[PDB]
Design a protein around this ligand. Structure first.
Ligand SMILES: O=C(O)CNC(=O)C(=O)O
Ligand SMILES: [Mg+2]
Ligand code: NI
Ligand SMILES: [Zn+2]
Length: 331
């Protein structure tokens, strides 16, 4: 068995190997990358996402989200308070202000220490979940707006044609902006490209150990667990690495820098934080290996998780028994 300790693997494809996205994902899996839940892909030196980032300031962040924490420093939830619209240039200036800017630090480990000590005492503002793309249309390799769609994969594997579309999303971050512990919708893959700015630190639980994280979360968030049998789908709970280690939960960590891709694998729980002003692009995708994970994915039906249009068909076809209850949650 390849990668039996479930380490995060880092890949350096050549420009030739960067042509065929599906083939490269399957290669990485042949080497055991999926066992970690997360892999890094450093693009060949010949590649670029676009020519420059000098002209992005007028992108609008219609609904910036202030991430307000409750709990203790290593075990907390966050809620998203909606703020007034602002441009990317306005958000960048805000990120760099004395109130929000990255503190002085020695290295990524020192900054990570400071994040976990102090996150809860601040409420950073995240420009998350913005439909759009920063890939040039002429970028032919690993262009996250030109991937094969999940609806087409389902149709190719299973023969059933379904409605829905699959487009990318932009994330503009600042120091301390946080992504809570989650798997993707329908336990899909994700791919995330850090276009510019400061790093993103990731934590990940191997898919084979995801239920250990779920059991800890039920213990640590006992009201939420009574409310919903899949409350991590709400994407609000944070647990620090120190607390994970105290509770014996297997996990790994890695820091993504600008110009690098991360892939999350089906049922790989992940969480993390941004180091300072940055911009990432991410999208979900599927492969043949995903289908069995999609059929088994948990679902929130309490009403909180509320998701895209395109998840309907995935539930309907892969999980027909659960469909009626889940759809009630959506309505
Ligand atoms: O970058 C972020 O805030 C969150 N990203 C992801 O969870 C992802 O790409 O799957
Ligand atoms: Mg612009
Ligand atoms: Ni994710
Ligand atoms: Zn729920």
């Amino acid at each position: 068995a390849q990668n039996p300790n479930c380490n995060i693997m880092i890949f350096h494809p050549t420009k030739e190997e960067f042509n065929d996205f599906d083939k490269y994902i399957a290669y990485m899996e042949s080497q055991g990358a999926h066992r970690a839940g997360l892999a890094k892909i450093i693009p060949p030196k010949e590649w670029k996402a676009r020519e420059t980032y000098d002209n992005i300031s007028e992108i609008l962040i219609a609904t910036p989200l202030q991430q307000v924490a409750s709990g203790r420093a290593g075990v907390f939830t966050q809620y998203h308070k909606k703020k007034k619209a602002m441009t990317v240039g306005e958000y960048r200036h805000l990120a760099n202000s004395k109130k929000y800017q990255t503190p002085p630090h020695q290295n990524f480990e020192d900054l990570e220490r400071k994040y976990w000590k102090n996150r809860i005492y601040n409420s950073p503002i995240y420009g998350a979940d913005i439909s759009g793309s920063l890939f040039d249309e002429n970028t032919k390799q690993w262009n996250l707006g030109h991937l094969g769609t999940i609806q087409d994969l389902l149709e190719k594997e299973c023969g059933v044609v379904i409605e829905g579309v699959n487009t990318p999303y932009l994330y503009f971050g600042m120091w301390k902006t946080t992504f809570a512990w989650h798997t993707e919708d329908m336990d899909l893959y994700s791919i995330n490209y850090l276009h510019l700015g400061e790093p993103k630190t990731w934590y990940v639980v191997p898919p084979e150990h995801g239920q250990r994280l779920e059991r800890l979360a039920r213990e640590l968030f006992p009201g939420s667990s009574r409310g919903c049998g899949a409350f991590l789908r709400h994407k609000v709970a944070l647990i620090s690495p120190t607390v994970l280690k105290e509770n014996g939960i297997p996990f790994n960590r890695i820091t993504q820098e600008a110009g690098e891709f991360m892939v999350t694998f089906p049922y790989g729980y992940h969480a993390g934080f941004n180091h300072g002003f940055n911009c990432a692009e991410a999208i979900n995708f599927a492969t043949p290996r995903w289908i069995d994970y999609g059929k088994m994915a948990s679902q929130c039906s309490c009403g909180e998780a509320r998701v895209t249009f395109s998840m309907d068909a995935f539930v309907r076809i892969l999980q027909p028994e659960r469909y009626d209850l889940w759809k009630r949650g959506q309505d």
